[PDB]
């Protein structure tokens, strides 16, 4: 059998007995086939419904206990066996089971002792009986439990980012049944940026929270902090959802969605105007965003007809998410809490945004059609259909009850997107996976991202360029190195995937992959470096591993600076040079301009020797295990050499001018009739004029000063004339067109 065989039988008996009572009385016999088809979140709900009508059947109750046993939910499984046992006493093997499980989970309660006594008298002196007798003794004493607790605390002092240890603390709290302390630590730990990114931790967070909601302690204490803990559950679900989608398979991700949707339906009823309500708002958006990503995962593997229909469905999901407003940040108690929520807000808008675009780039106003056709409530049932099995009650499912009102159906603005990205860099602990995706998403767009601003948000007060550039010691790392690094990681990643899709043939849709579904986009080498330099900078390394981490970074530095044995293809170097020139040429301050321009000259000075050999159609010495994979896809050709020599010579003059060699700079600038040379020629003529323009000074000199301002005016005019005429030149502008016009207005009024 398969999934089709079992979900098609739904329509077989649905057409034979349609009343609700007989539909649920078939739940046990429905669940009979899902246990065989490996569906355990589904089989659970089928049998549980038959139990809602046949609550006195010992067979059905035991089957759920055996299913909760496969789920390893001891507290839930035990209770199920109990019901089957109290209905039918002849089930001896279940009296053993109850005794077996009670002694394995926790011995503190005498209930484990009681059921063991009964288990003994049903099986006199059997081999398992002693086994349980030794197990019950195994558990440690009060001094022993406190002893274990002290180890974890002393261990957590120096290792607060260890996933396993923090998990054990929650398990120890849960073992002493002081769940309030378990969630308390669970709540204070969702502020940890590292733990929030851990799949296993968030899963534990979901259980320890749920356990507390149903726990007797949650009700008795008070109903005031009840809302607070409820928020964390939603937060955990969002984080857990993001991670499960990437690593786990299609089946597990869908199952988590149902837990997410159940929680949302249970929360919306309270409402209010506090952190929980604001949290519900942001988490609501995440749900659709992840739901859209989940949809696209299924379609990727599937045929073309489902792909378009699913992507259409996903496009609506991301849209819903993007529409959701920025959560009310002020309304939260603390700075950490509010900053986190906003961080996630930026993440939602950024990821959904780029997805919305790449899906809208497929066709003309593709977004408009999606809304006009599926914004209809008919889509709400078509969405619920594709994602879930229709058998689940469509009433308590948040998805089926949401009010889809006035979908904006407005494509996102790039400027807004940039600020969304920059604000969400710290969303996923700056994993190179995170950044390599964004960098690639902007690779198809006409505006480029502020990487240098990304790096400033991660490594604060890291200098743009280090004074001691002579050595490769990794204490001299600079934001330029990282910017230079990320450029290659993305330039490398794009080419590798380009080669991959060529091999995949089938249907070509390279832009469409979402962030969770795709696998590692960088080489494990590259990822190891980024993870190292990150842990080092943020001061979350290990004294022992310091020297190793430190050396691992040092290994690649000589390559990021195009030094001895750099594994750099000439094309990648060129890409770095111009990408830094244009990045720097648009900057306002002199410190940063000089730095970015310097490195650009550096890489230029390293390429030109290579270009000369390539200019005569010779061979480049290929690398030895290069850091950035070489590709013949982008191997440099002779057709473009003379331009680069020209484009490079400008860079020389620009630096000569900045250094003071105006005579040589001007002599060079005038030599080449380039749009960029105008903005440079003009900018330096303007400065020679402005300073000398108004002081009392020799009249003859004043006329010569004015003469330069006259030259400034002309060159700005040459820029705009050639700009309005041709679009290709507009893109060559070192600064925005309006900035050139802005100066001109002031230049002429002078």
């Amino acid at each position, epitope marked *: 059998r398969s999934k089709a065989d079992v979900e098609r039988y739904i329509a077989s008996v649905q057409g034979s007995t349609p009343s609700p009572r007989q539909k649920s009385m078939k739940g046990f016999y429905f669940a009979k086939l899902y246990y065989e088809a490996k569906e355990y979140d589904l089989a659970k709900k089928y049998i549980c419904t038959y139990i809602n009508v046949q609550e006195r059947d010992p067979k059905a109750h035991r089957f759920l206990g055996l299913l909760y046993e496969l789920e390893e939910n001891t507290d839930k499984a035990v209770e199920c066996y109990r019901r089957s046992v109290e209905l039918n006493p002849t089930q001896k093997d279940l009296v053993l089971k109850i005794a077996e499980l009670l002694c394995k989970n926790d011995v503190t309660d005498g209930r484990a002792k009681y059921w063991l006594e009964r288990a003994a008298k049903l099986f006199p002196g059997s081999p398992a009986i002693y086994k349980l007798k030794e197990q019950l003794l195994d558990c440690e004493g009060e001094d022993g439990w406190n002893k274990l607790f002290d180890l974890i605390q002393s261990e957590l002092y120096v290792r607060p980012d260890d996933v396993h240890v923090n998990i054990r603390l929650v398990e120890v709290y849960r073992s002493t049944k002081r769940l309030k302390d378990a969630v308390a630590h669970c709540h204070e730990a969702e502020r940890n940026i590292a733990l929030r990114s851990s799949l296993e931790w968030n899963s534990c967070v979901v259980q320890t929270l749920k356990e507390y909601l149903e726990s007797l302690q949650c009700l008795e204490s008070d109903k005031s902090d009840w809302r607070a803990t409820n928020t964390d559950l939603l937060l955990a679900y969002a984080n857990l959802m993001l991670l499960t989608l990437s690593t786990r398979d299609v089946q597990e991700s869908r199952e988590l969605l149902q837990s997410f949707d159940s929680a949302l339906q249970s929360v919306k009823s309270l409402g209010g105007n506090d952190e929980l309500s604001a949290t519900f708002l942001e988490m609501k958006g995440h749900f659709y965003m992840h739901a859209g990503s989940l949809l696209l995962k299924m379609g990727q593997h599937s045929s073309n007809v489902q792909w378009r229909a699913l992507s259409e469905l996903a496009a609506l999901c991301y849209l819903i998410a993007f529409q959701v407003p920025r959560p009310k940040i002020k309304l939260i108690k603390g700075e950490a809490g509010q900053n986190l929520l906003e961080m996630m807000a930026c993440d939602r808008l950024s990821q959904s945004g780029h997805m919305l675009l790449n899906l809208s780039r497929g066709k003309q106003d593709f977004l408009k059609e999606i809304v006009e056709t599926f914004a209809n409530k008919s889509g709400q049932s078509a969405l619920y259909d594709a994602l879930f099995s229709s058998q689940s009650p469509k009433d308590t499912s948040f998805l089926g009850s949401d009010d889809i009102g006035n979908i904006d159906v407005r494509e996102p603005e790039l400027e807004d997107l940039t600020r969304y990205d920059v604000g969400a860099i710290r969303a996923h602990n700056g994993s190179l996976q995170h950044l390599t995706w964004l960098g690639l998403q902007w690779n198809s767009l006409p505006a480029l991202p502020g990487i240098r601003k990304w790096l400033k948000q991660l490594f604060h007060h890291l200098p743009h360029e280090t004074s001691r550039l002579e050595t490769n010691a990794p204490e001299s790392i600079c934001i330029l190195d990282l910017e230079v690094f990320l450029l290659g990681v993305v330039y490398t990643s794009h080419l590798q995937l380009k080669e991959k899709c060529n091999s995949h043939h089938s249907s070509y849709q390279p832009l469409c992959l979402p962030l969770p579904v795709c696998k590692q986009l960088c080489t494990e080498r590259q990822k190891s470096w980024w993870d190292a330099v990150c842990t080092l900078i943020h001061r979350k390394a*290990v004294p022992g591993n310091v020297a190793k981490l*430190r050396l691992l970074v040092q290994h690649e530095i000589n390559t990021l600076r195009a030094q001895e044995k750099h594994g750099l293809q000439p094309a990648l170097l060129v890409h770095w040079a111009e990408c830094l020139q244009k990045t720097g040429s648009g900057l306002n301050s002199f410190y940063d301009q000089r730095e970015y321009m310097g490195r650009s000259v550096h890489y230029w000075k390293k390429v030109l020797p290579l270009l000369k050999i390539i200019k005569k159609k010779n061979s480049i010495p290929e690398p030895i295990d290069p850091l950035f994979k070489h590709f013949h896809s982008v191997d440099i050709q002779a057709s473009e050499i003379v331009e680069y020599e020209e484009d490079a010579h400008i860079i020389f003059a620009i630096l000569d001018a900045v250094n003071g060699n105006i005579e040589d700079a001007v002599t060079a600038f005038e030599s080449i009739k380039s749009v960029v040379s105008y903005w440079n020629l003009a900018l330096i003529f303007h400065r020679k004029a402005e300073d000398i323009e108004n002081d009392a000074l020799s009249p003859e000199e004043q006329e010569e000063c004015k003469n330069y301002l006259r030259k400034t005016r002309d060159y700005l005019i040459k820029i705009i004339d050639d700009s309005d005429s041709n679009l290709s030149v507009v893109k060559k502008l070192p600064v925005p067109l309006e900035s050139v016009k802005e100066m001109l207005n002031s230049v002429m009024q002078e």
Partner: antibody
Amino acid sequence: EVQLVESGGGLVQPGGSLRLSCAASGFNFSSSSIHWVRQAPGKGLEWVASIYSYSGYTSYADSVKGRFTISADTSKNTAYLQMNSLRAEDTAVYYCARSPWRWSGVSDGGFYYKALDYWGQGTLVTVSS
Amino acid sequence: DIQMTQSPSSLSASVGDRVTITCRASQSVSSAVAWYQQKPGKAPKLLIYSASSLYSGVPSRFSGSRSGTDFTLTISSLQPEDFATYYCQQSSSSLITFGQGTKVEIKR
């Protein structure tokens, strides 16, 4: 261009709490180990806390162990000395200083620092009810 | 616990003298000792690191030396600007300790 600035001092009552701020600039804060060294009036230098260069494992003198807490923030490029259960005995001039990774060596049984190159001006802390 | 015993506590000398201060480590300690100059009220400044290596910028008349567990600071020709208090410092495993200090008073 390179300096250390101490702040967050002032007077406090015994059994109270304070928080000192050692602001650094000009050298990469990640690769530097941070220390605090107090000096009562007319007395000598007393080491009270340390933070290993690249990770930040703490180490305190037994005279203040468990009461003080020293921390380092990469985003703010600043170190702090959190002080609790302050006693009249803690009245002293508190200095901070760095020791590069070049001078920070890790060995079996604990770590050692070759010397303290950069020192701060020193912020005064008075503890008296 | 390791202890750095500094001697003398208070010294009196005049200009040009060849002055010597010594610190003894109770336990056998490796060459991870330092020396500092602290003028009244000001901050302490680093003179010698790693026992006998001179900190860049410190005058050449300062020199450190070791013999067994006794470390010694040596000034070849005393100058007027060196009349201040000095301290010796050891860095053992996850612990730092300073000497009691040595005041260099002008003799008259």
